[PDB]
Amino acid sequence: XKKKKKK
Amino acid sequence: XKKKKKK
Amino acid sequence: XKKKKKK
Amino acid sequence: XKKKKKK
Amino acid sequence: XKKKKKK
Amino acid sequence: XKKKKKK
Amino acid sequence: XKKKKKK
Amino acid sequence: XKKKKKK
Amino acid sequence: XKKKKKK
Amino acid sequence: XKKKKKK
Amino acid sequence: XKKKKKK
Amino acid sequence: XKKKKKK
Amino acid sequence: XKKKKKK
Amino acid sequence: XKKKKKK
Amino acid sequence: XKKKKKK
Amino acid sequence: XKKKKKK
Amino acid sequence: XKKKKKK
Amino acid sequence: XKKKKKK
Amino acid sequence: XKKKKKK
Amino acid sequence: XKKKKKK
Amino acid sequence: XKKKKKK
Amino acid sequence: XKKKKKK
Amino acid sequence: XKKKKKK
Amino acid sequence: XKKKKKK
Amino acid sequence: XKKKKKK
Amino acid sequence: XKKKKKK
Amino acid sequence: XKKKKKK
Amino acid sequence: XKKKKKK
Amino acid sequence: XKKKKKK
Amino acid sequence: XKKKKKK
Amino acid sequence: XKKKKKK
Amino acid sequence: XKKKKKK
Amino acid sequence: XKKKKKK
Amino acid sequence: XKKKKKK
Amino acid sequence: XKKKKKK
Amino acid sequence: XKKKKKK
Amino acid sequence: XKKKKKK
Amino acid sequence: XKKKKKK
Amino acid sequence: XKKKKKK
Amino acid sequence: XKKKKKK
Amino acid sequence: XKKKKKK
Amino acid sequence: XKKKKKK
Amino acid sequence: XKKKKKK
Amino acid sequence: XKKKKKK
Amino acid sequence: XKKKKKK
Amino acid sequence: XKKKKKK
Amino acid sequence: XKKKKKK
Amino acid sequence: XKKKKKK
Amino acid sequence: XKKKKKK
Amino acid sequence: XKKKKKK
Amino acid sequence: XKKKKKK
Amino acid sequence: XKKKKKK
Amino acid sequence: XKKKKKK
Amino acid sequence: XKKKKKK
Amino acid sequence: XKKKKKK
Amino acid sequence: XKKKKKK
Amino acid sequence: XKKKKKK
Amino acid sequence: XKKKKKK
Amino acid sequence: XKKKKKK
Amino acid sequence: XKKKKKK
Amino acid sequence: XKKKKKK
Amino acid sequence: XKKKKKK
Amino acid sequence: XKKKKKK
Amino acid sequence: XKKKKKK
Amino acid sequence: XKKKKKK
Amino acid sequence: XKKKKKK
Amino acid sequence: XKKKKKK
Amino acid sequence: XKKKKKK
Amino acid sequence: XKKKKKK
Amino acid sequence: XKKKKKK
Amino acid sequence: XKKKKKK
Amino acid sequence: XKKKKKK
Amino acid sequence: XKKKKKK
Amino acid sequence: XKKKKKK
Amino acid sequence: XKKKKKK
Amino acid sequence: XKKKKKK
Amino acid sequence: XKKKKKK
Amino acid sequence: XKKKKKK
Amino acid sequence: XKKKKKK
Amino acid sequence: XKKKKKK
Amino acid sequence: XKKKKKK
Amino acid sequence: XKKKKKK
Amino acid sequence: XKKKKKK
Amino acid sequence: XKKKKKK
Amino acid sequence: XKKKKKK
Amino acid sequence: XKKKKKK
Amino acid sequence: XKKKKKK
Amino acid sequence: XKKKKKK
Amino acid sequence: XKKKKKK
Amino acid sequence: XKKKKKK
Amino acid sequence: XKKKKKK
Amino acid sequence: XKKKKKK
Amino acid sequence: XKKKKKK
Amino acid sequence: XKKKKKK
Amino acid sequence: XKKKKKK
Amino acid sequence: XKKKKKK
Amino acid sequence: XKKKKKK
Amino acid sequence: XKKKKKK
Amino acid sequence: XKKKKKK
Amino acid sequence: XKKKKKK
Amino acid sequence: XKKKKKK
Amino acid sequence: XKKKKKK
Amino acid sequence: XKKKKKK
Amino acid sequence: XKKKKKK
Amino acid sequence: XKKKKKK
Amino acid sequence: XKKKKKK
Amino acid sequence: XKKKKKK
Amino acid sequence: XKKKKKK
Amino acid sequence: XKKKKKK
Amino acid sequence: XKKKKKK
Amino acid sequence: XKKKKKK
Amino acid sequence: XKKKKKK
Amino acid sequence: XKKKKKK
Amino acid sequence: XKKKKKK
Amino acid sequence: XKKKKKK
Amino acid sequence: XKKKKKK
Amino acid sequence: XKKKKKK
Amino acid sequence: XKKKKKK
Amino acid sequence: XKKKKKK
Amino acid sequence: XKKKKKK
Amino acid sequence: XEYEYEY
Amino acid sequence: XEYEYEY
Amino acid sequence: XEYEYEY
Amino acid sequence: XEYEYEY
Amino acid sequence: XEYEYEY
Amino acid sequence: XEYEYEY
Amino acid sequence: XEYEYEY
Amino acid sequence: XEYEYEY
Amino acid sequence: XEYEYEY
Amino acid sequence: XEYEYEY
Amino acid sequence: XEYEYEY
Amino acid sequence: XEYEYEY
Amino acid sequence: XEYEYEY
Amino acid sequence: XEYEYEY
Amino acid sequence: XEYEYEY
Amino acid sequence: XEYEYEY
Amino acid sequence: XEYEYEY
Amino acid sequence: XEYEYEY
Amino acid sequence: XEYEYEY
Amino acid sequence: XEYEYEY
Amino acid sequence: XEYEYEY
Amino acid sequence: XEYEYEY
Amino acid sequence: XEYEYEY
Amino acid sequence: XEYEYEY
Amino acid sequence: XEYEYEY
Amino acid sequence: XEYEYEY
Amino acid sequence: XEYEYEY
Amino acid sequence: XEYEYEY
Amino acid sequence: XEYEYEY
Amino acid sequence: XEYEYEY
Amino acid sequence: XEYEYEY
Amino acid sequence: XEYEYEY
Amino acid sequence: XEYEYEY
Amino acid sequence: XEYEYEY
Amino acid sequence: XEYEYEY
Amino acid sequence: XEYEYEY
Amino acid sequence: XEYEYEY
Amino acid sequence: XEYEYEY
Amino acid sequence: XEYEYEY
Amino acid sequence: XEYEYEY
Amino acid sequence: XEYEYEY
Amino acid sequence: XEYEYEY
Amino acid sequence: XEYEYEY
Amino acid sequence: XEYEYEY
Amino acid sequence: XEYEYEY
Amino acid sequence: XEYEYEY
Amino acid sequence: XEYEYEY
Amino acid sequence: XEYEYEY
Amino acid sequence: XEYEYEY
Amino acid sequence: XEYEYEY
Amino acid sequence: XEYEYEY
Amino acid sequence: XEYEYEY
Amino acid sequence: XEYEYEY
Amino acid sequence: XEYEYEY
Amino acid sequence: XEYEYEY
Amino acid sequence: XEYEYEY
Amino acid sequence: XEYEYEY
Amino acid sequence: XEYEYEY
Amino acid sequence: XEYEYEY
Amino acid sequence: XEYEYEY
Amino acid sequence: XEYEYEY
Amino acid sequence: XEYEYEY
Amino acid sequence: XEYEYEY
Amino acid sequence: XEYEYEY
Amino acid sequence: XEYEYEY
Amino acid sequence: XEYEYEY
Amino acid sequence: XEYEYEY
Amino acid sequence: XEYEYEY
Amino acid sequence: XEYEYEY
Amino acid sequence: XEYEYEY
Amino acid sequence: XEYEYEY
Amino acid sequence: XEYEYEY
Amino acid sequence: XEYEYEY
Amino acid sequence: XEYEYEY
Amino acid sequence: XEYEYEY
Amino acid sequence: XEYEYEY
Amino acid sequence: XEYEYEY
Amino acid sequence: XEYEYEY
Amino acid sequence: XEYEYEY
Amino acid sequence: XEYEYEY
Amino acid sequence: XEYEYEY
Amino acid sequence: XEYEYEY
Amino acid sequence: XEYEYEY
Amino acid sequence: XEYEYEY
Amino acid sequence: XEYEYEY
Amino acid sequence: XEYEYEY
Amino acid sequence: XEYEYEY
Amino acid sequence: XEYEYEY
Amino acid sequence: XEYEYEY
Amino acid sequence: XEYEYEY
Amino acid sequence: XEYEYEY
Amino acid sequence: XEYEYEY
Amino acid sequence: XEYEYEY
Amino acid sequence: XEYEYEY
Amino acid sequence: XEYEYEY
Amino acid sequence: XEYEYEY
Amino acid sequence: XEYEYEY
Amino acid sequence: XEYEYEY
Amino acid sequence: XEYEYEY
Amino acid sequence: XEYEYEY
Amino acid sequence: XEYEYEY
Amino acid sequence: XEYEYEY
Amino acid sequence: XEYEYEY
Amino acid sequence: XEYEYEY
Amino acid sequence: XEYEYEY
Amino acid sequence: XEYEYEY
Amino acid sequence: XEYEYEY
Amino acid sequence: XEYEYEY
Amino acid sequence: XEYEYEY
Amino acid sequence: XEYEYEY
Amino acid sequence: XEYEYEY
Amino acid sequence: XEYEYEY
Amino acid sequence: XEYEYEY
Amino acid sequence: XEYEYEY
Amino acid sequence: XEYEYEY
Amino acid sequence: XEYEYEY
Amino acid sequence: XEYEYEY
Amino acid sequence: XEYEYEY
Amino acid sequence: XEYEYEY
Amino acid sequence: XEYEYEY
């Protein structure tokens, strides 16, 4: 598996 | 697997 | 696998 | 796999 | 696979 | 696969 | 596959 | 495949 | 495939 | 395929 | 394919 | 294919 | 194909 | 194809 | 194709 | 094709 | 094609 | 094609 | 084509 | 084509 | 084509 | 074509 | 074509 | 064409 | 064409 | 064409 | 054409 | 054409 | 044409 | 044409 | 044509 | 033509 | 033509 | 023509 | 023509 | 023509 | 013519 | 013519 | 013519 | 013529 | 013529 | 003529 | 003439 | 003439 | 003439 | 003449 | 004449 | 004449 | 004459 | 004459 | 004459 | 004459 | 004459 | 004359 | 004358 | 004358 | 496995 | 496994 | 396993 | 295992 | 005449 | 005449 | 005449 | 005549 | 005539 | 005539 | 005529 | 005629 | 005619 | 015619 | 015619 | 015609 | 015709 | 016709 | 026709 | 026709 | 026709 | 026709 | 027809 | 027809 | 027809 | 027809 | 037809 | 038809 | 038809 | 038809 | 038809 | 039809 | 039809 | 039809 | 039809 | 139809 | 239809 | 239809 | 239709 | 349709 | 349609 | 349609 | 459609 | 459509 | 469509 | 569509 | 569509 | 679409 | 679409 | 689409 | 799409 | 798509 | 897509 | 995608 | 994707 | 992806 | 990905 | 990925 | 990844 | 990764 | 990674 | 990694 | 790593 | 690492 | 004569 | 004468 | 005569 | 005569 | 005559 | 005659 | 005659 | 005649 | 005649 | 005749 | 005739 | 005739 | 005739 | 006739 | 006839 | 006829 | 016829 | 016829 | 016829 | 017829 | 017929 | 017929 | 017929 | 027929 | 028929 | 028929 | 028929 | 029929 | 039929 | 039918 | 039918 | 039908 | 039908 | 039908 | 139908 | 239908 | 239908 | 339908 | 439909 | 449909 | 549909 | 549809 | 659809 | 659809 | 759809 | 769809 | 879709 | 989709 | 999609 | 998608 | 996706 | 995705 | 993804 | 991903 | 990922 | 990842 | 990762 | 990681 | 890591 | 790490 | 007367 | 006367 | 007367 | 007367 | 007368 | 007368 | 007358 | 007359 | 007359 | 007349 | 007449 | 007449 | 007439 | 007439 | 007439 | 007429 | 006429 | 006429 | 006519 | 006519 | 006519 | 006509 | 016409 | 016409 | 016409 | 016409 | 026409 | 026409 | 036409 | 036309 | 046309 | 046309 | 056309 | 056309 | 066309 | 076309 | 086309 | 087309 | 097309 | 196409 | 196409 | 296409 | 395509 | 395609 | 494609 | 494709 | 493809 | 593909 | 592919 | 692929 | 692939 | 692959 | 692969 | 692989 | 692999 | 592998 | 491997 | 391996 | 291995 | 191994 571009 | 472009 | 463009 | 353009 | 342009 | 232009 | 232009 | 122009 | 112009 | 101009 | 101009 | 101008 | 002008 | 002007 | 002016 | 002016 | 003016 | 003015 | 003025 | 004025 | 004025 | 004034 | 005034 | 005034 | 006034 | 006044 | 007044 | 007044 | 008054 | 008054 | 009053 | 009053 | 009163 | 009163 | 009163 | 009263 | 009263 | 009363 | 009363 | 009463 | 009463 | 009463 | 009573 | 009573 | 009574 | 009674 | 009674 | 009674 | 009774 | 009785 | 009785 | 009785 | 009885 | 009886 | 008896 | 008896 | 790009 | 790019 | 790139 | 790149 | 001197 | 001297 | 001297 | 000297 | 000298 | 010298 | 010398 | 010398 | 010398 | 010398 | 010499 | 010499 | 010499 | 010599 | 010589 | 010689 | 010689 | 010689 | 010789 | 020789 | 020789 | 020889 | 020989 | 020989 | 020979 | 021989 | 022979 | 022979 | 023989 | 033989 | 034989 | 034989 | 035989 | 036989 | 036989 | 037989 | 037989 | 038989 | 039979 | 039979 | 039968 | 039968 | 039967 | 039957 | 039947 | 039947 | 039936 | 049936 | 049926 | 049926 | 059915 | 069915 | 069915 | 079914 | 089913 | 099913 | 199922 | 299932 | 299942 | 399951 | 009374 | 009374 | 009374 | 009374 | 009274 | 009274 | 009275 | 009165 | 009165 | 009165 | 009065 | 009065 | 008055 | 008056 | 007056 | 007046 | 006046 | 006046 | 006046 | 005037 | 005037 | 004037 | 004037 | 004038 | 003028 | 003028 | 002028 | 002028 | 002018 | 001019 | 000019 | 000019 | 000029 | 010029 | 020129 | 020129 | 030129 | 030129 | 040139 | 040139 | 040239 | 050249 | 050249 | 050349 | 050359 | 050459 | 050459 | 050559 | 050669 | 040669 | 040769 | 030769 | 030869 | 030969 | 030969 | 031959 | 032969 | 032969 | 043969 | 043969 | 010589 | 010489 | 010589 | 010589 | 010689 | 010689 | 010789 | 010789 | 010789 | 010889 | 010889 | 020989 | 021989 | 021989 | 022989 | 022999 | 033999 | 033999 | 034999 | 034999 | 035998 | 035998 | 036998 | 036998 | 037998 | 038998 | 038997 | 039997 | 039997 | 029996 | 029986 | 029976 | 029975 | 029965 | 029964 | 019964 | 019954 | 019953 | 019943 | 019942 | 019932 | 009922 | 009911 | 009911 | 109900 | 209901 | 309901 | 309801 | 409801 | 509801 | 709801 | 809801 | 909801 | 929700 | 939620 | 939430 | 949340 | 949260 | 949080 | 937080 992911990319989690939180904010 | 995902991309999670939260915000 | 997805893209989740939340907001 | 999808794109989920929520909002 | 889909596009789900919710809202 | 579809496009689901909900709203 | 379809387009589903709901609303 | 169709187009479903519901509403 | 059709077009279904419901409403 | 048809067009179905329901309503 | 037809056109079905129901109503 | 026809046209079916029902109603 | 015909035209069917029912009603 | 005909025209069928029923009613 | 004919015309059928029924009624 | 004819015309059939029934009724 | 004829004309058939039945009735 | 003829005319048939039945009745 | 003739005319047939039956009745 | 003739005329046939039957009746 | 003739005239046939039967009856 | 003649006239045939039968009856 | 003649006239035939039968009867 | 003649006249034939039969009867 | 003649006249034939039979009867 | 003549006259033939038979009978 | 003559007259023939037979009978 | 003559007159022939037979009978 | 003459007169022939036969009989 | 003459007169022939036969009989 | 003459008169011939035969008989 | 003459008169011939035969008989 | 003359008179011929034969017989 | 003359008179000929034969017989 | 003359008179000829033969016989 | 003359008179000829033969016989 | 003359009179000729032959015989 | 003359009178000729032959015989 | 004259009178000729022959015989 | 004259009178000629021959014989 | 004259009278000629021959014989 | 004269009278000529020959013989 | 004269009278000539020959013989 | 005269009278000539020859012989 | 005269009278001439020859012979 | 005169009278001439020759012979 | 005169009378001439010759011979 | 005169009378002339010759011979 | 006169009378002339010659011879 | 006179009378002339010649000879 | 006179009378002339010549010879 | 006179009478003339010549010779 | 007179009478003339010549010779 | 007179009478004249010549010779 | 007178009478004249010449010679 | 007178009488005249000449010679 | 992931990338977690928090902030 | 991960990368955790906090801040 | 990890990398933890804090700050 | 890790790397901890604090600061 | 005569003379007749009557009375 | 005569003379008749009557009275 | 005559003379008749009556009276 | 005559003479008749009546009266 | 005559002489009749009546009266 | 005659002489009749009446009156 | 005659002489009649009446009156 | 006669002489009649009436009157 | 006669002489009648009336008047 | 006669002589009648009336008047 | 006669002589009638009237008047 | 006659002589009538009237007037 | 006659002679009538009227007037 | 006659002679009538009127006037 | 006659002679009538009127006038 | 006659002679009528009027005038 | 006659002679009428009027005038 | 006659002769009428009027005038 | 006659002769009428008018004028 | 006649002769009418008018004029 | 006649002769009419007018003029 | 006649002859009319007018003029 | 006649002859009319006018003029 | 006639003859009319006008002029 | 007639003859009309005008002129 | 007639003849009309005008001129 | 007639003949009209004009001119 | 007629003949019209104009000219 | 007629004949018209103009000229 | 007629004939028109113009010229 | 007629004939028109112009020229 | 007619015939028109122009020229 | 007619015939038109021009020229 | 007609015939037009031009030329 | 007609026939047009030009030339 | 017609026929046009040009040339 | 017609026929056009050009040439 | 027609027929056009050119050439 | 027509037929065009060119050449 | 037509037929075009060129050549 | 047509037929084009070129050549 | 047509048919084009070239050559 | 056509048919093109080239060659 | 066509058919192209080249060669 | 066509058919192309080349060769 | 076509068919291309080359060769 | 086509079919290409080469050779 | 096609079919290519080469050879 | 195609089919390529080479050989 | 294709099928390639080489050989 | 293909099928390659070589050989 | 393919199938390669070599040999 | 492929299948390679060599041999 | 592949399958390689060699032999 | 592969399968290699050699032999 | 592979499977190598040699033999 | 592999499996090597030799033999 | 491997498995080597030799034999 | 390996497994080596020799034999 | 290994396992070596020899035999 | 003589003066004869026969009384 | 003589003066004869026969008394 | 003589002067004869027969009284 | 003579002067005869027969009284 | 003679002067005869028969009284 | 003679001078005859028969009285 | 003679001078006859029969009185 | 003679001079006859029968009175 | 004779001079006859029968009175 | 004779001179006859019957009076 | 004779000179007859019957009076 | 004769000169007859019957008066 | 004769000269007859019946008066 | 005769000269008859019946008066 | 005769010369008859019936007057 | 005769010369008859009935007057 | 005869010369009859009935007057 | 006869010469009849009925006057 | 006869020469009849009824006048 | 006869020559009849009814005048 | 006869020559009838009814005048 | 007859020659009738009714005048 | 007859020659009738009704004049 | 007859020659009728009604004039 | 007849030759009728009604004039 | 007849030759009728109604003039 | 008849030859009718109504003039 | 008839030859009718109504002129 | 008839030959009708209405002129 | 008839030959009608209405002129 | 008829031959109608309305001229 | 009829041959109608309306000229 | 009819042959109609309206000229 | 009819042969109509409206000229 | 009809043969109509409107010229 | 009809044969219509509108020329 | 009809054969219409509008020329 | 109709055969229409609009020329 | 119709055969329309608009030329 | 129709056969339309717009030329 | 129609056969349309717009030429 | 239609057969349209726009040429 | 239609067969459209735009040429 | 349509068969469109735009040429 | 359509069969479109744009040539 | 359509069969499009753009050539 | 469409069958597109862009050639 | 479409069958696109860009050639 | 499409079948794209870019050739 | 598409079947793309770029050739 | 697509089936891409870049050839 | 795609099936890419770059050949 | 893709099936990439770079050949 | 991809299936990459670089060949 | 990918299946990489670099061959 | 990847399956790498570098061959 | 990767499965690396370097062969 | 990786599975490395360097062969 | 890695599984390293260096072979 | 690694599994190292150096073979 | 007397016996008278006047010598 | 007396016996008278006047000598 | 007397016996008278005047010598 | 008397016996008269005048010698 | 008397007995008269005038010698 | 008298007995007269004038000698 | 008298007895007259004039000798 | 008288007894007259003139000799 | 008288008894006259003129000899 | 008289008894006249002129000899 | 008289008794006349002229001899 | 008279009794005349001219001999 | 008279009794005339001219001999 | 008279009694005339001319002999 | 007279009694004439010319012999 | 007269009684004429010319013999 | 007269009584004429010309013999 | 007269009574004429010409014999 | 006359009574003529020409014999 | 006359009574003519020419015999 | 006359009464003519030519025998 | 006349009464003519030519026998 | 005349009454003609030619026998 | 005439009454003609030619026998 | 005439009354002609040719017998 | 005439009344002709040719017998 | 004529009344013709040819018998 | 004529009334013709040819018998 | 004519009235023809050919019998 | 004519009225023809051919019998 | 004609009225033809061929019997 | 004609009225034809062929019987 | 004609009115044809063929009977 | 014609009116044809073939009976 | 024609009106054909074939009966 | 024609009006055909084949009966 | 034609109006065909085949009955 | 034609109007065909085959009955 | 045609109007075909096959009945 | 045609209008076909097969009944 | 055609209008086909097969009934 | 065609309009086909198969009924 | 066609309009096919199979009913 | 076609419009097919199979009913 | 076709429009197929199988009903 | 086709539009298929199987109903 | 096709539009298939199987209903 | 196809548009398949199986309903 | 296909668009499949199985409903 | 296909678009499959199994509903 | 396919788009599968199993609903 | 496929897009599978199992709903 | 596939996109699997099991919902 | 697959994208599996089991929801 | 797979992307597994078990939700 | 797999991406496993068990949620 | 796998990426395991057990959440 | 695996990346295990047990959360 | 594994990366184990037990959280 | 493993990377174990037990948190």
Numbering used by the authors:
A (entry chain B), B (entry chain B), C (entry chain B), D (entry chain B), E (entry chain B), F (entry chain B), ...: 1 to 7
Text of the article:
Here, we exploit IDRs to enable context-dependent heterotypic assemblies of intrinsically disordered peptides, where “context-dependent” refers to assembly behavior driven by interactions with other molecules. Although the same-charged peptides cannot self-assemble, oppositely charged peptides form heterotypic nanofibers. pmcThis Communication reports the first cryo-EM structure of heterotypic assemblies formed by intrinsically disordered peptides and demonstrates their context-dependent assembly.
We selected KKKKKK as the positively charged intrinsically disordered peptide, a sequence found as a disordered region in proteins36−38 like KRas. We selected EYEYEY as the main negatively charged peptide for interacting with KKKKKK due to its presence in human proteins, such as MAP3K5, albeit without an experimentally verified ordered structure. Testing all possible indexed symmetries established that the nanofiber has C2 symmetry, with a helical rise of 4.68 Å and a twist of −4.22°, featuring parallel cross-β packing and six hydrophobic pyrene rings in the core. The nanofiber’s asymmetric subunit (ASU) contains three peptide copies: one Pyn-KKKKKK (1), one Pyn-EYEYEY (2), and a third with only an ordered pyrene ring. Moreover, analysis of the atomic model revealed multiple hydrogen bonds between tyrosine and lysine, and we have seen side-chain densities from the cryo-EM map to support those side-chain conformations. K1 forms three intermolecular hydrogen bonds with Y2 and Y4 from the same peptide and Y2 from another peptide, and tyrosine also forms an intramolecular hydrogen bond between Y2 and Y4. The conformationally disordered Pyn-EYEYEY and Y6 from the ordered Pyn-EYEYEY should allow hydrogen bonding with additional Pyn-KKKKKK, which explains the postassembly bundle formation. To verify this, we also synthesized Pyn-EFEFEF to interact with Pyn-KKKKKK and found that postassembly addition of Pyn-KKKKKK was unable to form well-defined bundles.
